[PDB]
Design a protein around this ligand. Structure first.
Ligand SMILES: N[C@@H](Cc1c[nH]c2ccccc12)C(=O)O
Ligand SMILES: N[C@@H](Cc1c[nH]c2ccccc12)C(=O)O
Ligand SMILES: N[C@@H](Cc1c[nH]c2ccccc12)C(=O)O
Ligand SMILES: N[C@@H](Cc1c[nH]c2ccccc12)C(=O)O
Ligand SMILES: [Cl-]
Ligand SMILES: [Cl-]
Ligand SMILES: [Cl-]
Ligand SMILES: [Cl-]
Ligand SMILES: [Cl-]
Ligand SMILES: [Cl-]
Ligand SMILES: [Cl-]
Ligand SMILES: [Cl-]
Ligand SMILES: [Co+2]
Ligand SMILES: [Co+2]
Ligand SMILES: [Co+2]
Ligand SMILES: [Co+2]
Lengths: 445, 445, 445, 445
């Protein structure tokens, strides 16, 4: 049997050590009384859309932050990342004639899993930084001791962020008439920028035609659905925000529409699998090179016992060198056992190089290579390449190498070569969108 | 005061001499008891659409037969002419983003005005052929004596023709998914054929996008309004088919949605002006080189005393040599007197050359030149070039010279160089549509 | 193998004896060259709607003339019968929340099957009157000899009638704002008239609500689909109007959307079954008391070999005394053999009493009793009561007894007590519609 | 000239005395960097809807808290108040056929104007409670000293509240299929409860009809616009949340869609008028008995110099005894000077009785009397009664006397008889909605 607190009886990885259990429990009770971020009916609607993807009738775009931070809590940052997501979505929707399910890694993507539980600099060892929802990035004792009050700050940043995202999605910002406005000003003077401009002009002509034909009325042209997701890592936060549906009695984790389990926390007997087992949300699991086909099926039996086609997103992150060797055997097992899953590529988390110094690099060419091979593997196996899962930014930076132009090495990006990972910029994201749109069009041809 | 028979008190041109007045009256009474071709509410809807054109928010496409004939009463002929009209309309709608009001010279365009009331061949003089609704094309006494029973045959051909047209317009034939099917098979292996194909592909992509966005539902994508028109020439026919609106009591000529007065029958004190004065239909007048600005205004005072913007279509047919010299003074008068009119170009009837032999030629280059100059004159005067009025066919023939390829001289086309006039073929009609679409796009830019 | 003329090799009932075979063949060739009444795509759309009925998601309303006549060829008669059909449809649609498929016995219901091939009055025996498409109602030699030219007159009346019906259905007459206007002025000063008025007011409030909510735009509120049907009896007419679909090559009888075989002409080895076997239209068969379950299945095997759910309408006409005894065994056979059929009640043709004099009476109470029992039988068997098939008129007459008020005995109705049968009037039709709407609401509850 | 800080140069009423100016300024800067609650485009959309009301084509429903509190920050409270607003809106929309603009006094209605700047209990005098955004309700020094950190707590409660409201409005909670679910369980066993049930059933029948007709698709049936409003009282909060529109450069107060000036702070030379003068939001002004016609016009000149019809809501709160004597002269002045305003009734704030003890009572019968007279006055003057502005709750309490049943005297309601004012409950709100719906229907008849 399941409860929102049943995870606490299981073995668990990646959790902080709080210094005062009672203080933690007080903050958890405060949070438990605060309004949810999402309505259960919305999570059901995302499941319905996931089922369209799983059936090959739509495509899942999931994108946003590596890890959101309290020091970057602005409307401009939120807006500009949303613009990139809209630009990618409209490229794929128009060029491929394919509905796109838009899910942001936003409004709650704070907690970060770490390779090591501690960090050492020149003879001093402190607890690892686990994201702003747990502790601070500064290498000092006060910063690194987990502080339960950070749960509430994360909640407050999430409600402000999602309120604004809902306002943009429904209130006119995402109206198709605004297609040119979604292109960030630093996408310019290039073949890619021209390509988007031309596509946007084709959309203008489409809308003018639909107006001349007597439509243009349709609310679908003026708004779009937008959903949120994050890794369900800090289960104290997730439990506090887990709530029963008023109508059905069924539990939903209402911190976000979609929750996923990370590659380091997907132990079948573990806490994270136990938490998501019993919520009604659509959910995801990160599937890295260590996953074999036997243990994948066992995980699916726990996380989707009814084999519902909108329930489960398998987010494959193998690396450009391993996707061809590892993915086919997993697909074959799913096909053999008749399982309904939404397959996505995370082409980023398997393609990070960490130097001895700790400095992280991601080569955009390896990113693109993994995406190309992911579609190739699905094509060979007769299965459906259903989505893309990326870390990106609307900021005018270059964090991944191998792009058209060289990396920028701004201090604001230092976080994204050490504690976090390198994100795609708008140019890279747009190039990826065009690649996917061409690939989808050929699949649907 | 007005009645459906008040025209009979006026001087009249272009009427046949029937041999038995009582026989004529019996056929008129039979017809008066037959159902109308159109519903008054439909004529009102066309007036509403004419008002959109007059205001510069739409464009009027009027096209079809020089004169319909009893010997060419087929579904294939009707369908193929309708295809050309759809192809022209969709080109202008998509390329210019402009609603197109589609009106066919069909389902009643039988009566023909003639330069001479008789015809002489080798010492024998007979009454002129005035169209199948009056008499027969054969040069012999029996054929040429007006036969009132031909009124009923024309009525029956009209109901069959319009029934089929309504079925095509509403029943799926004009669904935008059928855009490729409207291109006749002899439009091929040319730059123009490729141009339409490419536009049709853009429409497919538009519809696929609208489906991906969640529309594609809209009935407007599956059907289109279609209206009929003919010259109100044989007033016996028009009177019999003139009926009172059930709801409003007001009279409509229900032989067609739109009726026009020909260039030879527009005498301000004459029968034809008197007939149309008192019906509620949208109406047209042919305006040739003989029209001065004073008498135009006097005509408008009679035909549109309330200055209703959906009432009156001025159909300008000057010839490519005269449109620049004659049209500006007419527009200036309309602007000065604040009159609301829909200006159309008939670029055909002012560009016919009749040799001493009687053989008629129309140079497509002169046709295009008059259209170009018509738009030029409106541009210079600040008025709106609101429509095109053409004679065309879906048959695989070439009747007008100066086209990409030479004229065909098929016997079926002999009618159209003697009694009737040369029609545009599908290639010419499509070339014209692209010219207009480019011109409209530049007007709306 | 099948052709439009393959029926001519089979045994045939109910056909006229034409005096000149060559003359008949000339008229058939003339007709074969005239435009069709319907487009094959439309017949396909009606099949799609029949499939909705068969699945229990809609209801079939079929109504119109016993037999159309040349002497009653008016717009008013056509309009007023259409009003009754609209009133019945809107009652069932609004009160039961059930889509209604509207099919008129109109624009071609001329040929009549007869009990006897001749008629005798005071020592003189003449061929039976078989409807105006064959011969005349007058009891004299000239009238009764079949005249092939009547095929063309029937065609011409049909195109005029259907043109007008299409105009009403699509052009505004059937806009839901016109709901009060469909009530004929002689429905007044009664509980039934008040009941319709109140329902019409509820529709007004619905439309005002939808306008206030931001809809009211929808073309579905302004137009409705309308289809035609008649008994395929005079196969010469049907063959001439049978045409190949341009796109698919498949044959459709394009005289009407739906054709049915009469109770006297449904011999499994006969001409009428052979004709309809090979056309693509939705079709019907009249099923009277003489039908057993074995021969029904054999008929279905011929007429619907692929068991398509939109193909076949079984039109049950048993009489109020026999429907309970005869229908259950037929339903059981269809259920046992897994056949997909649309079951309708014709509650009129099994409830006619013919006196020794020849005078026909129909008791409206028996009509209602058969309808009630038809729904009862379906309820008991777990099958779907899918439609109603009636003979009705918009004329201010009373032809069936047992109505609220007594029969009128107008001369115009004498036809409908001798050669034709008594029709329901508007009051009776409305009462029936309310009965059906209540019954459907209880089925869907 | 105007800036977001120009109010600071003007004389000002109702402001707190903060103990540390620098601390206040630090919190203001923090807030100034946080995301806005609303998008400027949304405020423009509300102006567009206000213009519909002003023109007599819609009705404004504004309702919610007297003053929101930190101790009542729940999803249930937010949801249940939203249910009441939906129930009122759907009653007026369906029964009157009138679009309703829905605006909640929610997500920011914290600051309260007070009659006295201090409060004395048994020889101790402390600063007045001014709402949770300023200080605490407890009568003690620590509670009553203004604390600038409360600005941030109010912001955080507002983003959580509006996020949830947006989720309900767009995400399915406000789908018209949910009409029964908006009725709170304690509305039952009464004529009023039956009346709503019956109306909800009529809506179900409407939706079933629209489904049967082929609609039911429309996104307008599934979602609704919802906007927020509060009194712009604490100008420090408003200034921090005032932001420039990205596209137009123009300033909007992005704390809420609509802001109003209270009856005690509407001095024409004062700070509150100065603040709202220069923002682009739709705005309101409370108009009490002290307002004369000369000073109203002068206020309108400042707050709506362009006489835009969507800009200004005059919220009339006179008391049931004074509305008839005071309102007509104000309307006459507006009509004489050609001003475009949206007239609303606040029938609550002029109908409070404060005993010597301080205990506040509001008689629901006086509330209804003022509303009735407000509509009467507009009817007499030829102007439009455009909206209602109420304080209400979804809690199962009775705070206003004169209701069907007696007041409850729950401790949770003690706030609403001392510091705040008595709110309407769901029964009272529904009764009011029916009164208004009947009145609107008669206006539109
Ligand atoms: N009904 C729309 C679109 C449309 C349908 N079929 C068409 C054919 C040609 C042009 C446009 C259309 C219109 O008339 O504009
Ligand atoms: N609402 C549609 C169309 C749409 C609106 N805005 C968008 C932005 C991007 C992509 C599509 C859209 C959809 O989500 O598909
Ligand atoms: N969207 C429509 C209909 C609607 C949906 N939900 C509502 C709730 C109440 C009133 C109306 C509605 C409107 O706002 O009018
Ligand atoms: N077009 C819809 C609604 C409709 C329009 N006119 C009608 C007349 C009767 C019944 C329904 C309708 C339908 O056929 O259902
Ligand atoms: Cl909750
Ligand atoms: Cl690579
Ligand atoms: Cl008529
Ligand atoms: Cl030329
Ligand atoms: Cl054909
Ligand atoms: Cl009986
Ligand atoms: Cl901002
Ligand atoms: Cl009172
Ligand atoms: Co990362
Ligand atoms: Co001509
Ligand atoms: Co009969
Ligand atoms: Co108050």
């Amino acid at each position: 049997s399941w409860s929102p607190e049943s995870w606490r009886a299981k073995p668990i990885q990646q959790q902080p050590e709080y210094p005062d259990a009672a203080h933690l429990a007080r903050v958890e009770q405060t949070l438990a009384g605060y309004p949810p971020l999402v309505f259960a009916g919305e999570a059901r609607e995302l499941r319905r859309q996931f089922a369209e993807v799983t059936a090959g009738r739509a495509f899942l775009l999931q994108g946003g932050d590596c890890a959101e931070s309290f020091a970057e809590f602005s409307a401009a940052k939120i807006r500009d990342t949303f613009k990139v997501l809209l630009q990618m979505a409209v490229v794929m929707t128009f060029a491929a004639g394919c509905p796109v399910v838009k899910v942001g890694r936003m409004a709650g993507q704070f907690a970060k899993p770490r390779s090591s539980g501690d960090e050492t600099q020149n003879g001093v060892t402190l607890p690892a930084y686990r994201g702003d929802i747990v502790n601070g990035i500064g290498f000092d004792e006060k910063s690194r001791v987990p502080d339960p009050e950070r749960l509430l700050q994360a909640y407050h940043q999430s409600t402000a962020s999602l309120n604004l995202l809902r306002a943009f999605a429904q209130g006119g910002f995402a109206d198709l008439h605004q297609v040119h406005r979604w292109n960030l000003d630093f996408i310019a003077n290039s073949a890619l920028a021209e390509r988007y401009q031309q596509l946007a002009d084709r959309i203008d002509e489409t809308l003018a035609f639909m107006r001349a034909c007597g439509l243009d009325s349709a609310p679908q042209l003026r708004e779009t659905s937008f959903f949120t997701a994050h890794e369900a890592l800090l289960l104290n936060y997730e439990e506090a925000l887990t709530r029963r549906d008023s109508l059905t009695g069924e539990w939903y984790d209402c911190s976000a529409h979609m929750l996923w389990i990370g590659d380091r926390t997907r132990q079948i007997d573990g806490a994270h699998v136990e938490m998501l087992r019993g919520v009604g949300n659509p959910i995801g699991v990160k599937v890295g090179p260590s996953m074999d086909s036997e243990e994948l099926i066992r995980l699916i039996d726990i996380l989707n016992p009814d084999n519902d086609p909108g329930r489960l997103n398998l987010i494959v992150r193998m690396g450009a060198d391993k996707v061809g060797d590892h993915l086919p055997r997993l697909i074959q097992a799913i096909q053999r056992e008749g399982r309904q899953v939404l397959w996505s590529s995370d082409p980023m988390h398997g393609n990070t190089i960490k130097a001895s110094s700790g400095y992280k690099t991601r080569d955009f060419a390896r990113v693109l290579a993994e995406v190309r091979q992911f579609f190739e593997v699905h094509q060979a196996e007769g299965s459906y390449a259903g989505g893309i899962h990326i870390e990106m930014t609307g900021q005018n930076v270059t964090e991944c190498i191998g792009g058209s132009r060289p990396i920028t090495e701004d201090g604001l990006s230092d976080r994204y070569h050490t504690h976090c990972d390198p994100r795609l910029n708008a140019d890279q994201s747009l190039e990826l969108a065009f690649l996917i749109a061409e690939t989808l069009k050929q699949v649907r041809r």
